[PDB]
Swiss-Prot record:
Domain POTRA positions: 1-75
Cited function: Part of the outer membrane protein assembly complex (Bam), which is involved in assembly and insertion of beta-barrel proteins into the outer membrane. Constitutes, with BamD, the core component of the assembly machinery. Efficient substrate folding and insertion into the outer membrane requires all 5 subunits. A lateral gate may open between the first and last strands of the BamA beta-barrel that allows substrate to insert into the outer membrane; comparison of the structures of complete and nearly complete Bam complexes show there is considerable movement of all 5 proteins.
Gene encoding the protein: bamA
Periplasmic side: 101-108, 130-137, 161-176, 232-244, 274-282, 358-371, 415
Residue stretches spanning the membrane: 79-87, 90-100, 109-116, 120-129, 138-149, 159-160, 177-189, 218-231, 245-254, 263-273, 283-293, 348-357, 372-384, 405-414, 416-426, 441-445
Entry's Gene Ontology BP terms: cell adhesion; Gram-negative-bacterium-type cell outer membrane assembly; protein insertion into membrane
Keywords: Cell adhesion, Cell outer membrane, Membrane, Repeat, Signal, Transmembrane, Transmembrane beta strand
Outcome recorded upon mutating residue 445 to C: Reduced folding of OmpT
Stretches of the chain found on the membrane's Extracellular side: 88-89, 117-119, 150-158, 190-217, 255-262, 294-347, 385-404, 427-440
Annotated effect of mutating residue 312 to C: No effect. Lethal
Family: Belongs to the BamA family.
Effect of residue 437 to L: Very minor growth defect. Lethal
Protein name as it appears in the record: Outer membrane protein assembly factor BamA
Effect of residue 27 to K: Lethal, wild-type protein levels
Amino acid sequence: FYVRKIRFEGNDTSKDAVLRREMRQMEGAWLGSDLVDQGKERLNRLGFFETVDTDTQRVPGSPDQVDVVYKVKERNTGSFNFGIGYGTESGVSFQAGVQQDNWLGTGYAVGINGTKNDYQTYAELSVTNPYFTVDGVSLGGRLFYNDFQADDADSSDYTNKSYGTDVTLGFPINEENSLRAGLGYVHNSLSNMQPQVAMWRYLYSMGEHPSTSDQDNSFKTDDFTFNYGWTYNKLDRGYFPTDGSRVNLTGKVTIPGSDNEYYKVTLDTATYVPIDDDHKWVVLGRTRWGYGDGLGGKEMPFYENFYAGGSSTVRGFQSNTIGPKAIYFPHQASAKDLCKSDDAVGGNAMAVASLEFITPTPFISDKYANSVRTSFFWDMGTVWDTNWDSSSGYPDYSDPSNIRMSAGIALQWMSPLGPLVFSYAQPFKKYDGDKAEQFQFNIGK
């Protein structure tokens, strides 16, 4: 018996000539099991396969010829994910999931994700194909479920169960630049809303005028959107930058087939300026911007509002407190006129800025220095409601000018339990109903 052809079945991503080198069986030359078995074990030495087996196939219409088939399977192990942590005004957060790129030689990248915290429960099904022509260009699919409990996020009472879809293109415009664009669908099921002037104005705008009696009432919507974005990143290191910037522009727009008629746009900038030779003293320039409104006829959805205050925006203020507050019709909590509250609602417009100064950590003169970052900050921000008709006795929520600020210290440490962050700030400039939260902490999400 003699070998005619040495075939490689399941040679998906590994090259043909590569696998031909790791086996010394000559074509045309006499077949020997000794040379077949040695090629299989050498293919395992490469370690790019889970299972390698030999199968000598007989040639059709030949009493002598035999084809040597090496049936191989590449071990593309999927990504497994799990996450636990704490944070002031977010509480105990659970972030677990699982993604697979090899599924099922399509060759799309499929994944199932999940999130659970005090106010939000999220779940998604992802499907996207990278390469996809010239560069890592993509067309993505997203099937999501979301449950938001406004009372638990420090806002005025309501509950919004969301179901929707995403069809997003991801053009990599540079090594440091990305540009995404997509289509969307979103079903929002608003329920148990607490009556106030700020959210009843949008329901009166949508033509769905409800009751002012008590909490129980529904409002289901269906929307189709065009999503766009851009991400610039020139940060020297990932998690503790010293030089470079990061810009994120992510705005959406409603299609004329949707129930809601609105547009919303956001901008987030981070600028790191090192003032030395060893990048020990650095100045961080962070800014966050947001704007949206009811594009013709009606007002923008209050679930799409902008919020400020807390660990990620303005420290010294409890989560979501900065900006407008709810003006209730009956009573507030556990009367025959309007009731102004301390409970935030957010706004269609917000501007946040922050000047931070990172210094070397005192008391630590070691190689443990690149683990902890000490910073002194000055945080500033405001959120307002464009459509708040002051034509009253209640505060002008349409006024941008009342910008609230804080000063404080910050500590970041790559702790044995994961990323640890704690801040302590004084809210030196506060306005009517703004709630303070001096010490704020966040552990490894």
